[PDB]
Write an enzyme that holds these catalytic residues in place. Structure first.
Site, PDB file in Angstrom:
ATOM      1  N   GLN A   9      39.058  47.744  15.154  1.00  0.00           N
ATOM      2  CA  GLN A   9      39.719  47.423  16.416  1.00  0.00           C
ATOM      3  C   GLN A   9      40.384  48.684  16.958  1.00  0.00           C
ATOM      4  O   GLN A   9      40.892  49.461  16.194  1.00  0.00           O
ATOM      5  CB  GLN A   9      40.770  46.330  16.138  1.00  0.00           C
ATOM      6  N   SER A  88      38.907  47.379   8.677  1.00  0.00           N
ATOM      7  CA  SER A  88      39.554  46.098   9.024  1.00  0.00           C
ATOM      8  C   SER A  88      38.664  45.086   9.610  1.00  0.00           C
ATOM      9  O   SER A  88      38.012  44.469   8.944  1.00  0.00           O
ATOM     10  CB  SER A  88      40.818  46.318   9.897  1.00  0.00           C
ATOM     11  N   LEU A  89      38.648  45.021  10.890  1.00  0.00           N
ATOM     12  CA  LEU A  89      37.619  44.208  11.541  1.00  0.00           C
ATOM     13  C   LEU A  89      36.244  44.729  11.142  1.00  0.00           C
ATOM     14  O   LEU A  89      35.306  43.945  10.951  1.00  0.00           O
ATOM     15  CB  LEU A  89      37.788  44.216  13.077  1.00  0.00           C
ATOM     16  N   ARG A 113      39.864  34.896  13.605  1.00  0.00           N
ATOM     17  CA  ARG A 113      40.675  35.956  13.004  1.00  0.00           C
ATOM     18  C   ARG A 113      41.498  36.677  14.059  1.00  0.00           C
ATOM     19  O   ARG A 113      42.699  36.914  13.856  1.00  0.00           O
ATOM     20  CB  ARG A 113      39.813  37.002  12.257  1.00  0.00           C
ATOM     21  N   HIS A 197      48.372  44.372   8.605  1.00  0.00           N
ATOM     22  CA  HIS A 197      48.258  44.920   7.220  1.00  0.00           C
ATOM     23  C   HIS A 197      49.640  45.117   6.537  1.00  0.00           C
ATOM     24  O   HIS A 197      49.821  45.997   5.685  1.00  0.00           O
ATOM     25  CB  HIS A 197      47.332  46.157   7.133  1.00  0.00           C
ATOM     26  N   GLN A 245      43.399  40.855   3.077  1.00  0.00           N
ATOM     27  CA  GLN A 245      43.143  42.042   3.888  1.00  0.00           C
ATOM     28  C   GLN A 245      44.046  42.166   5.123  1.00  0.00           C
ATOM     29  O   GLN A 245      44.487  43.282   5.424  1.00  0.00           O
ATOM     30  CB  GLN A 245      41.669  42.135   4.301  1.00  0.00           C
TER      31      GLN A 245
END
Length: 305
Positions: A9, A88-89, A113, A197, A245
């Site tokens: 992202q 991440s994504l 998400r 995070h 995550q």
């Protein structure tokens, strides 16, 4: 031999993937498939709705669909990865590439998400500072002392000299004060997203865990190095790991070290953007690296073939 590193992202831009979309049917098919799953025209969103594109609940499926399409294009030109990872994504894109997550499943799942992350931690809430050129120990300790005042932890371990801390305003301000004292020279405030995070995202992670329980994962067709544990992910652990995550540090450089130990020589960052490439160049300037996000970058890669 080769690892594909998938974008996260923040790397999106208006019109990304449009050149590939018109030119390559494997690309058009991938994006129109995501549009069906979503119940709205993702291609039009990407091309024309700049504010929505930058809204987390649309950014996540926009990038994932675009990235999966670029990887699928690379597959058609004869590049197959030996290992994958994603920021991440980008871990979800990598899950799709690694055979473990169905593409249409991925698209619906990251729309959810994105939503959960956005509501639990809006883009302007909390704080994020990139701490440049200071030992990891120092940053961790500083954040630990400051935690009495609220949530503050390292969020992104990008390079040994580039670590982003995140969390609540007062707590993060106390952390940088402790860092300056300790002698940190370069602290860059960031205005990119909520404090993702960190434990602030625990509410997000609960909703995502319920959603993930519904997702049926398959066997890995190629090894994936996960963000959370910086280790090759096992099928029976995926949902537990994706659950954590969103609320635990992304450990990028450690993950790149696992791939170098697995003997991988060549790195291809799958677009949009060239953020991971910038990180791997600092981790290891001798590593062979390339990225693909558009026609020019595709040709620069292919001309070596």
């Amino acid at each position: 031999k080769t690892a594909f590193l998938f974008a996260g992202q923040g790397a999106q831009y208006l019109g990304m993937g449009r050149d590939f979309y018109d030119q390559y049917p494997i690309v058009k098919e991938t994006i129109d498939r995501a549009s069906q799953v979503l119940g709205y025209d993702l291609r039009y969103l990407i091309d024309t709705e700049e504010d929505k594109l930058n809204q987390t609940r649309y950014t996540q499926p926009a990038i994932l669909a675009t990235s999966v399409a670029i990887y699928r294009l690379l597959q058609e030109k004869g590049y197959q990865p030996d290992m994958v990872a994603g920021l991440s994504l980008g871990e979800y894109s990598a899950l799709v590439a690694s055979g473990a997550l169905d593409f249409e499943d991925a698209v619906a799942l990251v729309a959810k998400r994105g939503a959960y992350m956005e509501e639990a931690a809006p883009a302007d809430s909390g704080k994020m500072v990139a701490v440049l050129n200071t030992p990891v120990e120092v940053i961790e300790e500083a954040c630990q002392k400051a935690s009495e005042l609220g949530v503050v932890t390292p969020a992104n371990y990008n390079t040994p000299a580039q670590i982003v801390i995140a969390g609540e305003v007062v707590a993060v301000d106390r952390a940088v004060e402790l860092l300056q004292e300790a002698g940190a020279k370069r602290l860059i405030p960031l205005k990119v997203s909520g404090p993702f995070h960190t434990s602030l995202l625990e509410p997000a992670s609960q909703k995502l865990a319920e959603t993930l329980a519904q997702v049926s994962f398959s066997d890995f067709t190629c090894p994936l190095v996960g963000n959370t544990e910086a280790a090759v992910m096992q099928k029976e652990d995926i949902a537990q790991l994706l659950t954590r995550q969103v609320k635990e540090p992304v450990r990028f450089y450690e993950s790149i070290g696992v791939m170098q130990e697995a003997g991988i020589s060549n790195f291809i960052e799958i677009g949009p953007g060239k953020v991971l490439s910038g990180f791997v160049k600092k981790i290891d300037q001798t590593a062979h690296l390339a990225h693909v996000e558009d026609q020019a970058s595709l040709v620069a890669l292919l001309e070596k073939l």
